[PDB]
Design a protein around this ligand. Structure first.
Ligand SMILES: [Mn+2]
Ligand SMILES: [Mn+2]
Length: 336
């Protein structure tokens, strides 16, 4: 009769903002940057015994560092600066966002190969074979400790999703090479497979926003429908660049903004560019023979207090150090 606490943390829509630096203003900021969101990560890890960290994608594109690296290109064996940073943070898994496709599939494969953590995506299919182009889900053996100090191997399943709209947004890069299936339909079909293979917890990492529209296949923003799929234990999301739980979502049926649940499922969307860290806390109990979630909550933790005008997250010294060369090159690139 063990009780386990599990914390799941999430970065989303970093958009290659590794540095807390605005290259157009050519000046530092306290408002965004992974180097600051890393302080929120370290703090959240220290508050608990058991934790895991995921990235929700839209990470290799969308700021000058990204622009610089796209223009520079990647040769075989190169490590993209976002992974130079993220490889030090012990991510459990990465998910693909729509902007990961903006520079073509070759560029993407080379970029992902530099990550020292696995990537998932379940809904993109190789047009040549009918096989998922990527690993659709990961079941990861995770060492955890219960409330009595007893150690267990928890089998945590992670499954990732991208908007089907990449077929439009990146038509030139993707047309004839891949197709993309409906998010909810893909979740419904894989979750039973994952449970049959021994997943104890199922973590959806969805690069997709939240909408109250009635379900329709190929919906870009599918988090509502995901929250109704049996066996979903948590939803780590993004794409919308908004904050959940939060007031923007007060009018959605089954959204408990105080708890951070959507139809009883903990869910979090931590804004954009590293300006929040997503934090889901689950309570698990195995006294029925299976691990079951008995309590859950979620919040998005800001790096900056907007009312009080103060930072809540220091600039991480070591990451700045790792990024130094690429930061200078980025300053170079923007001036040229
Ligand atoms: Mn985005
Ligand atoms: Mn996006």
């Amino acid at each position: 009769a063990a009780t386990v606490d599990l914390r799941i943390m999430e970065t989303t829509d970093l958009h290659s903002n590794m540095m807390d630096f605005d290259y157009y203003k050519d000046a530092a900021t306290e408002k965004f940057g992974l180097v600051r969101t890393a302080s929120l990560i370290e703090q959240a890890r220290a508050e608990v015994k058991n934790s895991v960290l995921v990235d929700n994608g839209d990470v290799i594109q969308g700021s000058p560092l990204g622009d610089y690296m796209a223009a520079k290109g990647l040769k075989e064996g190169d490590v993209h600066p976002v992974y130079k940073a993220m490889n030090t943070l012990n991510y459990a898994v990465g998910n693909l966002g729509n902007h990961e496709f903006n520079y073509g599939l070759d560029f993407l494969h080379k970029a992902l190969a530099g990550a020292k953590f696995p990537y998932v995506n379940a809904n993109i299919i190789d047009a040549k074979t009918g096989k998922p182009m990527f690993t659709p889900y990961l079941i990861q053996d995770t060492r955890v400790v219960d409330s009595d100090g007893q150690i267990h191997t928890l089998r945590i399943g992670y499954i990732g999703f991208v908007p089907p709209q990449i077929m439009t947004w990146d038509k030139a890069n993707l047309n004839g090479k891949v197709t993309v299936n409906d998010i909810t339909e893909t979740a419904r079909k894989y979750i039973p497979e994952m449970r049959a293979k021994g997943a104890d917890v199922v973590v959806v990492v969805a690069h997709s926003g939240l909408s109250a529209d009635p379900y329709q296949a190929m919906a870009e923003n599918s988090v509502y429908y995901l929250s109704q799929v049996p066996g979903v234990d948590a939803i780590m999301f993004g794409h919308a660049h908004a904050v959940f739980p939060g007031k923007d979502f007060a009018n959605i049926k089954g959204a408990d903004i105080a708890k951070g649940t959507l139809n009883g499922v903990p869910a979090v969307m931590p804004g954009m560019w590293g300006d929040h860290l997503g934090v889901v806390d689950l309570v698990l109990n195995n006294d029925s023979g299976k691990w079951q979630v008995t309590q859950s909550k979620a919040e998005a933790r800001p790096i900056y207090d907007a009312v009080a005008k103060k930072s809540l997250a220091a600039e991480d010294g070591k990451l700045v150090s790792v990024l130094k060369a690429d930061h200078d090159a980025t300053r170079e690139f923007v001036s040229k």
